[PDB]
Design a binder for this molecule. Structure first.
Ligand SMILES: *[C@@H]1O[C@H](CO)[C@@H](O[C@@H]2O[C@H](CO)[C@@H](O[C@@H]3O[C@H](CO[C@@H]4O[C@H](CO)[C@@H](O)[C@H](O)[C@@H]4O)[C@@H](O)[C@H](O[C@@H]4O[C@H](CO)[C@@H](O)[C@H](O)[C@@H]4O)[C@@H]3O)[C@H](O)[C@H]2NC(C)=O)[C@H](O)[C@H]1NC(C)=O
Ligand SMILES: *[C@@H]1O[C@H](CO)[C@@H](O[C@@H]2O[C@H](CO)[C@@H](O[C@@H]3O[C@H](CO)[C@@H](O)[C@H](O)[C@@H]3O)[C@H](O)[C@H]2NC(C)=O)[C@H](O)[C@H]1NC(C)=O
Ligand SMILES: *[C@@H]1O[C@H](CO)[C@@H](O[C@@H]2O[C@H](CO)[C@@H](O)[C@H](O)[C@H]2NC(C)=O)[C@H](O)[C@H]1NC(C)=O
Ligand SMILES: CC(=O)N[C@@H]1[C@@H](O)[C@H](O)[C@@H](CO)O[C@H]1O
Ligand SMILES: *[C@@H]1O[C@H](CO)[C@@H](O)[C@H](O)[C@H]1NC(C)=O
Ligand SMILES: *[C@@H]1O[C@H](CO)[C@@H](O)[C@H](O)[C@H]1NC(C)=O
Lengths: 90, 147, 382, 222, 127, 344, 246
C-alpha cells in the first residue's frame, strides 16, 4: 500500500438503491435488512456495458468490497456468474 | 522484411513509449498439469517505467474449470530506483474456491484445458518485444501416475 | 605564547581549555660551549604523549608525568617538573606520532654541542629515558663536508629506522636513514638545490636530469606515514615518495609560499599551514593540493555563517591552530568580537568548501527557445 | 532546472566587455569597454541583474551614460579590485517588476510515498490495544520521490502522554535513500489510558495526500 | 562491493571492440596495496549498460605471511590498502543535508596478527 | 601530409599523446590548428602537436598548393603505459624466458619504441619499480588453453622474469596485470604470439640474385600464423626476414642452375618454415639452406604450366596440430589441373 | 580494375561501388591497377593500387571508401601487418644506404577512417555487443555441452537481435533462451545458447556406425542483426568438433 502513490481516476459505480449521493462518491447505508448493492465498472462509457462485464468474467475476474474501520478489516467477493443476462455485478 | 519496431518511430506516427520495462517468467517454457485436488504456483517479475504506472492483470482461458488467486508484492528496487514487483499466482480447480456458482463450475469429473496469461491492461503499442506471458494448463490426468 | 611561560591545557579536544602559568623556575643554563641566544620565557615544541608531557624553554627540556592509576602505579607520577638532558643544548624537540612496541618516543635535536648526535627518549610506564643513538661516532663523519647539522628528524617505531635530514657546511641537504637496531646509516636521498621547473606537468618524477628554475629549494621538515609507507618532505615545496628511493615533486604548491607545518588524518587526507596563514588540502589519492581557506568557497561559507548568525564565526579572527579529530578538520580560533571575544574550536568542512568553489567549466545549453547555464560535470561517475 | 538567461536580441549589452569599479560611494559603476554604438545599453535594461558565477551579483539600476551604469552589489565584500569580464563571461537576468513579473512562488508536488505492506495497518486511522506486558510492533517505509535530507531521518514522531507508553524506534537508510522505521510500543505498568503517537513528514509539502499518521494506543480490554 | 552509477551518456559505441566493453577507458576502479608481499587484492568486474551500473567486487586475502605466533596484540602488523576511482578524488562531492563528503576514495587499515577477543579456556564441565 | 604516433597501440592514444606532423611539398606557409591544440614551431613543415582538450580537432597545413584537412579524434583515457618483453629461448630445456617491464611511450627511448631495446631505460626502470611498489605484477595467460604463468620478484634492474614452454599448440598469449594505477594511468594488456624461432636463409658469397620482371610491382608473402617472418620479392633483390624487416637477408640462387632472364622472370613467391617456393616462368623451385632442386614430375608437380600456388591464410594451428593425420599445406594450379601439395 | 563481393553464403553477390557510384576503382586512381588487398580478423579490407592510393572496404558492406592521400605517387611500397594486427607501409628504394633501403612506417587506418566518417556522417546502430567466446576451438565428447552467452544493447525501439549462423555437420542441438529489458532509453537483449548432444548409446545395435554418424565438425558465428562501418566489433567465429581428443 503506497499512500501518496496518486489516484487520479475512479473506475466503479456502486449503488445501494436505498440511498446514494452524487455518483462521484459511493456511500452506502445499513439498516435491518441485508445490504444489497448493484455495481458496474465505469469506463469512457458512463452507462453500464455488457461487454466489460463479459470480458472480466471470461477472464475469471470479479470485484471485491473491502470494509475497513479503526479496528476492522473485512472482505466480500462478488460471486462469479455468466454475463449472458447480468448487466452489472450484484 | 519489415521491421515494425523501427517503423514505429516515424515522427508522423508519433507513438508513445512502452510503459513497462520488464515482464519475465519461466512459466512460458513448459506446460503444466493439475490433477484432482491439486494446485500449483506460478511466478512472474515485472518492472515498470520510471514514471508510468501500468496495471498488470492475470486471465485464464477457461474460468469454469480453473480458478486463480494472484498477489502482486513489491520486493526491493533496482539501481535506477525502479521498484520490482513479484506476481505470485495460486492456481487450482474452480469448485474449490467457492465464489463460483453451481452452474459456473460445471462438475469436476470431466477433464479440461485452460491457459493462464499475465498481461498489462493498459499497454500501448511499441510494446512488441514485451509480449504477455502465457502458459497452457491441463486439468487432467497426470502421466507419471502409476499403481 | 609570546613572552610568558603559559600554556593551553585542555581535556576532551579543545572543546574546553584552561590557560596555565607553568611552575618552572625559568633558570638560565647558558654556558661558554652552549650557543648564546636571547632569554625568552615562551614555551616551544610542546609534546603530549600518553601519561607524559614535555616542553622546551630556551634550550631546556622539562617533562611532567601524570598519576594515572588505571595505567600504572602512583609512584611513577612526578610531583614537579623534572628537567631532562641537563648538559646539552636542544634547539628543537621533534614528535613521534606513533607508539611502537608498547612505548612512546620523543626526539631532541642538539645544537652547538654534539651537533652530529641526536637524543631519543623512550617513555614506558611513565618512566622516561634518553640516549644518543649515533653512539661512538657522529653522522657528519659519513657525509661529505667538514661538519653537518641535523635540521629535522622522524623516527619509525616499526623497522627501528630514524629518518633525519642533514644540512652540510656547503648548504646542501641530505635525507639520511639510521637503523637503530644495527649501527649503520646510509644516505637515502640528496635534496636538489633550486626548484625543478614544470610547465604542463601537474607532477614531476625527479629523474636525475631535469631543468631547474633559479629559486633555491629550502626544506623545513619531513613526515612519514607508516600505514601506507608514504614519506613527505616539505618546506618551500612538497616531495612525496612511496619507497624511499624515487621522489615525486608536486607542482601545484607554489614555490613562493613556505610551509610552516603539516597535519595528517592517518586516513587519507592532509592539511598544510604556511607562514601566510593559508591552509592547503591534500588527498592521498590524487596528485593535487587545493587552497581551501583563501578561496571563493570559503568566502561563500563564511558569508553563510554570517547569514545564519553562527556563534563561532566573526568578521575578525585569528587562527590559533588546527588538528584532525576522527577524520574531521577542527580548527581552534580566537574570535575578536567586541565584548564577547573568545577562543573556540570550529569545524572546517572541506567537502563543503570544495562544493562551493564556484568558477567551474560551464556551457550555455538551449531550453525551449531559451538558453540557460549548465555547469559541466567533472566527476567520472554519477 | 538551470533558469533562462537574457537573450542577445532582447539586450545587446552582452555583446561587449564589462568593467566594474567600486565608485566613490556604494555604487559599483558598470562600464562597457567597446565604444561601438550598435551596443550601448537600451533603457529597457534597469532593474536587471548582471552576474558572473564565482563573483558578486550587481543590480544595474541607474543609467547615467550611453556606455556606463550604476548598480548595487550582493556580497560586496568579495570585490576589492577592478574586475574585467569578457563577452560570454558575464550574464544578465531579468527578475524586476518592469515589463511584468516573471518569477512566481507556488507549492511543490507530493514528494513522498508511505508504504505499509502489513494488512490492517494500511488504514490512515487505526487504534491498537495493549494488554499488560503486551507489545505492538509495526514498520513503515518512506520513498522520497526526489532529493532527500539524507543525514537526518525524513520522519519525526511525537507521543501524547509518554508516561504510560514506552516507545523504541529503529531507523535505517538504504542505497536508494528509502527510509525504514520500526516502532515498538509497550506499556509501562498496570494503569489504563490512551496516547496518540504521531509520525510526521516534516520535509514533505502540504500537497501530499498523507503527511502525518496518528495511531492511537489504548491500554485496555479490546 | 562498490557500485558505480555513471552518467547518462558515458559509454558510446566505440567502447565495444572485443568480447567486453573497455570500461577502464572511461570509468576505472583501482586498488593500491601497501606491503603487497603479504596481501592479495583481486578485483572482479561486471557492467550493466542499461542501468548505467558498474559492479566491482574487491576481495582482500591474507597471504599466510607477515607476523608470527604471538599473544593477541604483541605480533600485530599495521598495513592498509587504498581503493579509489581514477580522476574522482577532489572532483567528486556527495552533497547531503549538513554538508558535503569527499568521495571516490577510501583507505582501509588492516592489522595482521592475533585478533583481540580470542581466548582459550579449560572446559571443566566436559572434562 | 601525414602524422605519426609513438605507440602503435591506439588504446593508449589520448590527450597526453604527441602527434608528429610532417608535410612534404614544394611550398609551405604554416599550420592551421584549433585553439584546443598547441603546435611547436608553427612555421616548420615538420613539427609536434599536443591537444590538451578532448574532442575532434581539425588540422590543415596552409600551403601554396591545395591541401586536405584532417579531423583527429583525441579522447582522454586512463590507459597510458605499455608492457615490454624480451624473450630468450633454450632448446635444451625446451622452454623460453621472457623479461617484462613497464614503459611509457611518451618518455621511452627510441630503441624501446622500435622494440630493438634489450634493457630498460632510466625512465622505464623508475616507472617499473614504482609500479611494483604499488603492487603490480604481470602474468602471462595462454588464450587457447587457459594456462597462467606467474613471474618472480623484481630483479635488481626492473624486470619480471617468466618461464614458458615452447608449446607450439597455443601461440597466442596475453600479458596482463592487476588493477594498479600509478598516477591515474593503467597498463594496457599486450597480445603477442611467440613459438619456436624461425631461421631465415643465409646468403653464401658468389650466389646470383632473383628478381621480378622490370617494372612489375614488388610482391610480398608472410607466414600465416606468425607474421613478421616474411619474404619480399623486388625488382632488384629478394629479401627475407624473421622480424618486421628491421633486419633482412638476401635470398639468392647458386650459379649455373638457371639463366639470367630466368632469374629475372619469377612471378610468385611463398614462404614456409622449412623452405620457400619460387614460381619462375611456370615452373616451381624450392629454396632451402641445404639445396635448390626444382620440383618436377617425379614429385607430382607438372613443369612449365604452373600458373600459381597458395597456402592457408588463417591460423588454424590447434585443429591441424590435433588432426593426427597430416594434410596438404599448399595448392598449385596449371589452368587444367589442381595439385594439392603436402609437406616435404 | 574492379572489386567484387560475395556475402552471406553467396546470397548477396555483386560489385563494390564507390560512394560516387563509378564502381571502377582504376578510374579514381588515374589509370592505376589494383595491386594488393589486405583482410584481417576484425573485418576491414584495404585495397592498394600500384599508384599507392588506398580504398577501404568493410566485410558485409557493399560500399568502398576512398582514403586521403598518404604516399608519394612514385614510391615503391607494400602494405603489411606488423607484430600486432595494425597495418604498416614498407618503402623500398634503390640508391639508398643499403641499410635504409627497407623502411617500415605505421599507417593509422582507424583514425583516417574516423576522419572520413566525420565527413560522411555514418553511425553504429548499437552501442554494445558482448559475448563470452574467448577461444576459437571447442572440443567435447558425448556427455559435454557448452553455453554461449551474448548480449546486445541498442536504442529503444530500433529492432535488433543476434544472428547465429552454422556451417558444416548438423550433429548438435540448440537451446536458445533470451531476456529482453528496457531501461533509460536503451534495450538490452541477453541470450543464452546451449549446444548439446541428445543421442543415447546404451543397448543399441550398430554402435560404431552411430558413433561415426554423431562425430563431426561445425563452424559457428554470432553477429548483430544490422551493422555498418563505424562499428568496431569483431565478429566471433569458432569451431565445435564432436569426437575424441586422441
Ligand atoms: C548456404 O547456401 C547453400 C546453397 O546456397 C545451402 O546448401 C544447400 O543445401 C540444400 C539442403 O540443405 C541443398 O538442397 C538439396 O536438398 C535436398 C533435400 O530436399 C529434398 O529434396 C528432395 C529431392 O528428391 C525433394 O523431393 C524433397 O521434397 C526435399 O525438398 C537433398 O536431398 C539434396 O541432396 C542431393 O541433391 C542433389 C542435387 O542434384 C540430388 O541429385 C540428390 O539426389 C540429392 O537430393 C540437396 O541437399 C542444396 O543443394 C545446397 N546447395 C549447395 C550449393 O550446396 C546451405 O544450406 C546454406 N547454409 C546455410 C548455413 O545457410
Ligand atoms: C630450463 O632451463 C634453463 C636453462 O637450462 C633454466 O634457466 C635457469 O633457471 C634458474 C631457475 O631460477 C634461473 O634462476 C637462478 O636461480 C638461482 C637460485 O635457484 C639463483 O641463485 C640465480 O641467480 C638465478 O636467479 C637461472 O638464471 C636460469 N638461467 C638463465 C641463463 O637464465 C630454467 O630455469 C629452466 N626452466 C624450467 C621450467 O625447467
Ligand atoms: C620493546 O619493549 C619491550 C618491553 O615491553 C622490551 O622488552 C624488555 O627489554 C629490556 C631491555 O632489553 C629487558 O630488560 C626486559 O626484560 C624486556 N622485557 C620483556 C617483557 O621482554 C623490548 O626490548 C623492546 N624491543 C626490543 C626489540 O628491545
Ligand atoms: C669551523 C666551520 O667552518 N664550521 C662550520 C660552520 O661555520 C657552519 O655554519 C656549519 C654548517 O651550518 O658547518 C660547520
Ligand atoms: C445460473 O445461470 C443462469 C444462466 O443465466 C442464471 O439465469 C441463474 O441466475 C444462475 N443461478 C445462480 C444461482 O446464480
Ligand atoms: C539616478 O536615478 C535618479 C532617479 O532615481 C536620477 O534622478 C539621477 O539622475 C540618476 N543618476 C544620475 C547620475 O543621473
Amino acid at each position: 500500500v503506497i499512500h501518496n502513490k496518486g489516484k487520479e481516476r475512479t473506475y466503479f459505480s456502486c449503488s445501494g438503491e436505498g440511498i446514494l449521493t452524487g455518483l462521484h462518491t459511493i456511500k452506502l447505508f445499513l439498516t435491518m435488512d441485508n445490504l444489497k448493492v448493484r455495481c458496474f465498472f465505469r469506463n469512457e462509457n458512463q452507462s453500464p456495458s455488457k461487454e466489460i462485464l463479459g470480458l472480466f468474467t471470461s477472464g475469471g475476474l470479479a470485484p471485491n468490497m473491502i470494509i475497513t474501520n479503526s479496528t476492522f478489516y473485512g472482505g466480500y467477493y462478488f460471486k462469479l456468474t455468466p454475463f449472458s443476462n447480468r448487466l452489472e455485478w450484484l | 522484411t519489415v521491421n515494425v519496431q523501427s517503423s514505429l518511430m516515424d515522427e508522423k506516427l508519433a507513438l508513445q513509449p512502452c510503459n513497462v520495462e520488464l515482464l519475465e517468467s519461466t512459466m512460458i517454457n513448459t506446460m503444466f498439469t493439475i490433477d484432482m485436488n491439486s494446485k500449483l504456483k506460478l511466478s512472474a517479475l515485472m518492472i515498470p517505467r520510471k514514471g508510468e504506472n501500468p496495471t498488470p492483470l492475470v486471465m485464464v482461458s477457461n474460468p469454469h474449470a480453473l480458478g486463480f488467486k494472484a498477489n502482486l508484492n513489491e520486493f526491493g528496487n533496482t539501481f535506477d530506483g525502479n521498484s520490482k514487483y513479484k506476481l505470485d499466482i495460486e492456481l487450482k480447480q474452480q469448485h474449490h474456491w467457492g465464489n463460483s456458482d453451481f452452474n459456473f463450475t460445471a462438475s469436476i469429473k470431466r477433464h479440461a484445458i485452460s491457459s493462464v496469461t499475465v498481461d498489462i491492461a493498459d499497454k500501448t503499442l511499441s510494446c512488441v518485444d514485451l509480449k504477455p506471458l502465457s502458459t497452457l494448463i491441463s486439468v487432467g490426468c497426470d502421466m507419471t501416475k502409476k499403481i | 605564547f609570546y613572552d610568558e611561560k603559559s600554556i593551553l591545557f585542555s581535556d576532551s579536544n579543545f572543546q574546553d581549555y584552561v590557560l596555565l602559568e607553568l611552575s618552572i623556575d625559568s633558570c638560565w643554563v647558558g654556558s661558554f660551549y652552549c650557543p648564546i641566544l636571547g632569554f625568552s620565557a615562551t614555551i616551544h615544541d610542546a609534546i603530549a604523549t600518553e601519561s607524559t608531557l614535555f616542553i622546551r624553554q630556551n634550550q631546556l627540556v622539562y617533562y611532567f608525568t601524570g598519576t594515572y592509576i588505571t595505567l600504572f602505579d602512583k609512584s611513577h607520577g612526578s610531583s614537579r617538573w623534572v628537567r631532562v638532558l641537563p648538559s646539552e643544548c636542544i634547539k628543537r624537540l621533534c614528535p613521534v606520532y606513533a607508539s611502537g612496541n608498547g612505548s612512546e618516543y620523543v626526539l631532541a635535536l642538539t645544537t652547538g654541542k654534539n651537533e652530529g648526535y641526536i637524543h631519543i627518549g623512550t617513555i614506558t610506564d611513565g618512566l622516561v629515558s634518553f640516549e644518543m643513538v649515533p653512539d661512538g661516532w657522529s653522522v657528519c663523519e659519513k657525509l661529505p663536508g667538514k661538519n653537518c647539522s641535523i635540521d629535522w628528524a622522524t623516527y619509525i617505531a616499526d623497522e627501528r629506522n630514524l629518518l633525519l635530514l642533514v644540512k652540510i657546511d656547503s648548504g646542501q641537504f641530505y635525507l639520511v636513514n639510521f637503523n637503530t637496531e644495527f649501527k649503520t646509516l646510509n644516505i637515502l636521498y640528496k635534496i636538489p638545490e633550486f626548484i625543478p621547473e614544470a610547465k604542463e606537468l601537474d607532477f614531476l618524477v625527479l629523474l636525475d636530469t631535469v631543468t631547474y628554475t633559479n629559486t633555491p629549494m629550502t626544506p623545513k621538515g619531513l613526515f612519514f606515514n607508516t600505514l601506507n609507507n608514504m614519506l613527505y618532505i616539505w618546506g618551500n615545496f612538497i616531495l612525496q615518495s612511496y619507497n624511499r628511493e624515487e621522489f615525486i615533486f608536486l607542482a601545484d604548491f607554489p614555490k613562493e609560499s613556505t610551509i610552516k607545518y603539516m597535519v595528517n588524518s592517518f586516513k587519507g587526507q592532509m592539511a598544510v599551514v604556511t607562514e601566510n596563514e593559508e591552509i592547503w588540502y591534500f588527498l592521498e589519492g590524487g596528485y593535487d593540493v587545493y587552497q581551501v581557506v583563501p578561496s571563493q568557497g570559503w568566502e561563500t561559507y563564511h558569508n553563510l555563517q554570517k547569514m545564519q548568525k553562527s556563534s563561532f564565526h566573526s568578521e575578525d579572527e585569528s587562527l590559533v591552530s588546527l588538528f584532525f579529530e576522527d577524520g574531521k578538520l577542527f580548527q581552534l580560533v580566537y574570535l575578536f568580537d567586541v565584548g564577547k571575544e573568545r577562543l573556540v574550536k570550529r569545524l572546517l568542512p572541506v567537502g563543503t568548501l570544495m562544493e562551493y568553489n564556484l568558477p567551474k567549466p560551464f556551457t550555455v545549453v538551449n531550453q525551449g527557445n531559451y538558453q540557460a547555464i549548465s555547469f559541466t560535470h567533472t566527476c567520472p561517475f554519477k | 532546472v538551470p533558469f533562462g538567461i537574457e537573450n542577445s536580441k532582447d539586450s545587446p549589452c552582452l555583446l561587449s566587455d564589462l568593467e566594474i569599479t567600486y565608485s566613490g560611494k556604494l555604487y559599483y559603476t558598470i562600464k562597457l569597454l567597446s565604444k561601438n554604438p550598435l551596443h550601448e545599453l537600451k533603457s529597457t535594461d534597469v532593474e536587471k541583474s548582471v552576474l558572473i558565477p564565482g563573483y558578486s551579483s550587481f543590480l544595474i539600476m541607474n543609467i547615467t551614460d550611453k556606455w556606463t551604469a550604476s548598480a548595487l552589489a550582493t556580497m560586496p565584500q568579495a570585490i576589492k579590485s577592478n574586475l574585467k569580464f569578457l563577452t560570454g563571461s558575464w550574464f544578465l537576468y531579468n527578475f524586476g517588476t518592469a515589463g511584468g513579473r516573471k518569477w512566481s512562488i507556488s507549492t511543490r508536488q507530493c514528494n513522498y510515498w508511505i508504504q505499509q505492506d502489513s494488512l490492517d495497518f494500511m488504514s490512515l486511522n487505526l487504534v491498537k490495544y495493549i494488554d499488560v506486558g503486551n507489545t505492538i510492533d509495526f514498520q513503515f517505509k518512506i520513498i522520497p520521490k526526489a532529493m532527500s535530507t539524507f543525514p537526518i531521518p525524513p520522519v519525526s514522531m511525537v507521543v501524547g502522554n509518554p508516561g504510560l507508553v514506552e516507545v523504541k524506534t529503529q531507523g535505517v537508510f538504504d542505497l536508494n535513500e528509502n527510509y525504514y522505521l520500526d516502532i515498538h510500543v509497550s506499556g509501562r505498568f498496570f494503569q489504563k489510558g490512551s496516547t496518540s503517537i504521531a509520525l510526521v513528514l516534516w520535509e514533505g509539502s502540504s500537497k501530499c495526500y498523507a503527511i502525518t499518521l496518528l495511531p492511537t494506543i489504548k491500554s485496555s480490554c479490546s | 562491493t562498490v557500485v558505480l552509477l555513471s552518467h547518462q551518456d558515458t559509454f558510446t559505441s566505440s567502447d565495444s571492440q572485443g568480447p567486453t566493453i573497455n570500461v577502464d577507458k572511461k570509468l576505472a576502479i583501482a586498488v593500491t596495496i601497501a606491503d603487497p608481499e603479504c596481501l592479495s587484492v583481486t578485483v572482479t568486474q561486471d557492467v550493466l549498460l542499461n542501468r548505467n551500473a558498474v559492479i566491482n567486487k574487491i576481495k582482500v586475502i591474507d597471504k599466510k605471511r607477515c607476523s608470527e605466533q604471538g599473544m593477541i596484540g604483541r605480533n600485530i602488523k599495521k598495513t592498509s590498502m587504498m581503493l579509489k576511482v581514477l580522476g574522482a578524488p577532489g572532483n567528486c562531492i556527495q552533497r547531503t543535508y549538513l554538508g558535503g563528503i569527499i568521495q571516490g576514495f577510501k583507505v582501509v587499515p588492516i592489522f595482521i596478527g592475533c585478533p583481540p577477543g580470542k581466548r582459550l579456556a579449560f572446559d571443566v564441565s566436559y572434562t | 601530409w601525414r602524422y605519426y604516433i609513438n605507440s602503435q597501440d591506439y588504446s593508449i592514444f589520448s590527450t597526453r599523446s604527441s602527434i608528429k606532423l610532417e608535410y612534404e611539398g614544394n611550398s609551405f606557409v604554416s599550420w592551421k590548428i584549433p585553439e584546443s591544440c598547441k603546435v611547436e614551431n608553427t612555421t616548420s613543415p615538420k613539427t609536434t602537436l599536443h591537444c590538451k582538450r578532448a574532442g575532434i580537432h581539425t588540422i590543415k597545413p596552409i600551403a601554396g598548393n591545395q591541401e586536405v584537412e584532417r579531423h583527429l579524434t583525441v579522447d582522454n583515457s586512463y590507459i597510458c603505459y605499455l608492457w615490454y618483453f624480451t624473450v630468450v629461448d633454450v632448446y635444451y630445456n625446451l622452454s623460453q624466458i621472457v623479461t617484462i617491464w613497464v614503459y611509457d611511450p611518451e618518455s621511452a627511448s627510441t630503441e624501446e619504441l622500435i622494440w630493438t631495446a634489450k634493457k630498460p631505460s632510466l625512465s622505464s626502470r623508475v616507472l617499473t619499480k614504482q609500479m611494483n611498489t604499488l603492487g603490480q605484477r604481470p602474468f602471462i595467460f595462454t588464450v587457447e588453453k587457459r594456462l597462467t604463468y606467474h613471474p618472480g620478484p623484481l630483479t635488481s634492474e626492473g624486470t619480471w622474469v617468466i618461464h614458458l614452454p615452447m608449446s607450439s599448440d597455443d601461440i597466442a598469449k596475453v600479458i596482463r596485470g592487476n588493477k594498479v594505477a600509478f598516477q591515474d594511468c593503467f597498463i594496457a594488456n599486450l597480445y603477442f604470439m611467440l613459438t619456436y624461432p624461425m631461421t631465415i636463409i643465409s646468403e653464401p658469397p658468389g650466389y646470383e640474385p632473383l628478381t621480378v620482371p622490370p617494372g612489375s610491382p614488388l610482391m610480398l608473402s608472410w607466414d600465416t600464423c606468425i607474421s613478421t617472418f616474411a619474404l619480399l620479392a623486388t625488382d632488384q633483390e629478394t629479401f627475407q626476414t624473421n622480424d618486421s624487416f628491421q633486419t633482412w637477408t638476401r635470398v639468392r640462387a647458386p650459379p649455373g642452375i638457371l639463366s639470367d632472364a630466368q632469374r629475372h622472370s619469377l612471378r610468385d613467391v611463398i614462404i614456409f618454415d622449412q623452405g620457400t617456393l619460387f614460381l619462375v616462368d611456370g615452373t616451381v623451385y624450392l629454396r632451402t639452406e641445404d639445396e635448390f632442386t626444382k620440383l618436377d614430375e617425379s614429385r607430382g608437380i607438372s613443369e612449365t604450366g604452373i600458373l600459381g600456388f597458395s597456402k592457408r591464410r588463417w591460423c588454424q594451428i590447434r585443429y591441424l596440430y590435433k588432426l593426427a593425420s597430416k594434410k596438404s599445406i599448399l595448392i598449385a594450379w596449371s589452368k587444367t589441373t589442381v595439385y594439392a601439395g603436402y609437406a616435404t | 580494375h574492379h572489386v567484387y563481393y560475395s556475402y552471406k553464403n553467396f546470397t548477396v553477390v555483386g560489385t563494390i561501388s564507390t560512394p560516387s557510384g563509378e564502381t571502377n576503382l582504376s578510374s579514381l586512381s588515374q589509370g592505376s591497377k589494383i595491386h594488393q588487398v589486405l583482410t584481417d580478423r576484425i573485418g576491414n579490407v584495404v585495397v592498394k593500387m600500384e599508384n599507392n592510393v588506398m580504398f577501404y572496404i568493410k566485410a558485409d558492406i557493399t560500399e568502398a571508401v576512398i582514403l586521403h592521400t598518404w604516399v608519394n605517387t612514385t614510391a615503391k611500397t607494400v602494405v603489411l601487418f606488423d607484430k600486432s594486427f595494425e597495418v604498416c607501409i614498407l618503402y623500398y628504394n634503390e640508391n639508398l644506404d643499403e641499410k635504409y633501403q627497407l623502411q617500415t612506417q605505421p599507417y593509422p587506418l582507424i583514425l583516417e577512417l574516423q576522419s572520413i566518417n566525420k565527413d560522411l556522417g555514418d553511425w553504429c546502430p548499437y552501442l554494445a555487443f558482448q559475448h563470452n567466446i574467448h577461444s576459437q576451438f571447442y572440443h567435447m565428447d558425448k556427455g559435454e555441452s557448452l553455453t554461449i552467452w551474448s548480449q546486445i544493447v541498442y536504442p529503444e525501439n530500433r529492432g535488433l537481435y543476434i544472428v547465429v549462423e552454422h556451417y558444416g555437420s548438423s550433429v548438435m542441438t540448440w537451446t536458445q533462451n533470451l531476456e529482453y529489458e528496457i531501461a533509460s532509453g536503451f534495450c538490452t537483449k541477453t541470450m543464452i545458447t546451449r549446444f548439446f548432444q541428445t543421442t543415447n548409446y546404451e543397448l543399441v545395435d550398430n554402435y560404431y556406425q552411430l558413433q561415426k554418424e554423431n562425430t563431426g565438425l561445425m563452424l559457428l558465428q554470432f553477429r548483430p542483426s544490422e551493422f555498418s562501418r563505424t562499428c568496431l566489433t569483431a565478429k566471433p567465429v569458432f569451431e565445435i568438433d564432436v569426437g575424441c581428443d586422441s
